């Protein structure tokens, strides 16, 4: 028992991480292969952030402008591209330590593990969510940039974010593996500000059977919903609305519990109705939104 | 800016578990140097759970009833010994992965990640802290037993706690790596009720800095308190009272944000007085208290 905001292990990300100099900007590389991945805005001056032109600052650019560093060996660059937003660094030797690794793009309300780093150097791991607004709500600092998002399945690590920018509003944005990034961003030094920070449904959900699991029972009641009736209140509420979809996701949970998706939907509507009137559940005083089905169903389970 | 329920990163750690099976009970086992730790309920059957006689246990076992796997690995016993609640399989292979350690015992209220294991496998990293009670909440399952807590200085891993249990409440006891319990708490099934978790008072005051540097401002008011007065409310609300060192302790937190402690110290006063009002702190709608000031620092300036 217990349920704890857990992230991955970091090993396997930590082994990838290297640090990338281009000009006075110092961030961070994901090595992988002989590849090193990181934000093209690696290569802009103070004057270059307002409006780069990066394929113009490009140009300028050599291999050996790029000063990449894993651990403190240096590693030669023999080649570099721009997919989108990141550079892409070709090395001349392969990672070593590179995991069994897939480049995936996700979907609004799932989650990964963040593993923060500084000049190449992990300094912590966190577990966070992709916003229903595409911000992220990380711990990064100046430095941060081309930190990763992860998740794993067994051996196989999914790269999903890497880590760009904060947004004026201290949010922070960024990329798929791919340079994509996430909502409608750019990596420009300008006036972005981001939607509606809706609370993910689901993942609520989620969390109250993993309450359940854990003994904290309290907000169940004798109530059962629909999916408009229960998607009436949570659009009053800025909550996403719920899809047959979800309801299905959740099926795992409904079953070891016994409580089905509809009643579980009535006892947030309730929740989000009246409070929790100075309550707590799992240790917190709000609804939890950042842990997947799969997530609680992996805790409770103990997922290796 | 953001500020996150940070983790250490676990590679450091994931190099040193392994499997331990003994009869028919697997756990974790803790590799370092020719040294694996693991909790000496390891050599208990269903009927010694309730009383048993480790002493008397451990002599019915020799060095290859205990099956140590690293990966999928078999490592040769080479000679075993009780300390306390842990059991040292001496092995005849020093782990190549063992990195710079210490072992040390922490104080209530000190924070430390743990890295969740099951048949050696690590399944997730998460942070907690050591209760006033001596009981940590933690997100364990069977099979758990054996994982490890722990810091780390750059380099050096501090380990500082071994998870053995889970008491009938659902929280959870284990031992430093002497195999000294934290708490009253003895490795046998039974009635083992903790003791008042009070709220840990310095680490709050310190999240209250890193919400001010992160602009969750609103808490601030126009007053301030003496360490007495303080502590009179503390009392009322189950808090740990403040001493003079936790005021030194959170003296580089009130030189960066200007606000004198004790003027901090107020504001908690009126959070504990007239709650949050359906409010939030980086957010959080409760008072978080699983952060050192030394964490705070540490995430607000990106030691790696
Ligand atoms: C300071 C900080 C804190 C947390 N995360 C990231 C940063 N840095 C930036 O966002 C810098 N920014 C400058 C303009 C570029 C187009 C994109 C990068
Ligand atoms: C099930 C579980 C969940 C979370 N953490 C740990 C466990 N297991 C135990 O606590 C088992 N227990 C049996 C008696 C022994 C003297 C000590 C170990």
């Known amino acids: 028992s217990g349920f704890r905001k857990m992230a991955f292990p970091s090993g ?25 991945y990181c934000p093209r805005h690696v290569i802009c001056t103070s004057e270059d ?29 023999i080649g570099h591209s721009m997919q989108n937003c990141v550079l892409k660094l070709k090395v001349d030797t ?20 963040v593993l923060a780093c500084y000049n190449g150097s992990p300094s912590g791991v966190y577990q966070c969510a992709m916003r229903p607004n595409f911000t992220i709500k990380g711990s990064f600092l100046n430095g941060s940039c081309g930190s990763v998002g992860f998740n ?9 974010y890497m880590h760009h920018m904060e ?11 791919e340079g994509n990034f996430y909502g409608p961003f750019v990596d420009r030094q300008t006036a972005q500000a981001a939607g509606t920070d809706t609370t993910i449904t689901v993942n609520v959900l989620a969390w109250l059977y993993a309450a359940v699991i854990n003994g904290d029972r309290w907000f169940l009641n004798r ?34 519990t016994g409580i089905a998706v509809l009643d579980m939907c009535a006892s947030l509507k309730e929740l989000l109705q009246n409070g929790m009137n100075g309550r707590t559940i799992l ?17 409770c389970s103990g997922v290796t």
Chains 1, 2 share one sequence.
């Not at 949570?234 to 979800?246: F, G, V």
């Not at 240790?283 to 992996?298: I, M, N, Q, Y």
């Open 49 to 77: 952030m307002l409006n780069p032109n990066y394929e113009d600052l490009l140009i300028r650019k050599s291999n050996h402008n790029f000063l990449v560093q894993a651990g403190n060996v240096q590693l030669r660059v």
């Open 12 to 36: 396997k990300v930590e082994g990838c991480m290297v640090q990338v100099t281009c000009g006075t900007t110092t961030l961070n590389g994901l090595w992988l292969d002989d590849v090193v």
């Open 152 to 160: 794993i399945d067994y051996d196989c690590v999914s790269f999903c």
């Open 223 to 256: 109530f059962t919903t629909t999916l408009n009736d229960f998607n009436l209140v949570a659009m009053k509420y800025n909550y996403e609305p719920l899809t047959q979809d979800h309801v299905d996701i959740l099926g795992p949970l409904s079953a070891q």
């Open 167 to 177: 947004l004026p509003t201290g949010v922070h944005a960024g990329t798929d593996l």
């Open 94 to 113: 392969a990672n070593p330590k590179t995991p069994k690794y897939k480049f995936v793009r996700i979907q609004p309300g799932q989650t990964f593990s």
């Open 283 to 299: 240790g917190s005083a709000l609804l939890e939104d950042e842990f997947t089905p799969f997530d609680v169903v992996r805790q």
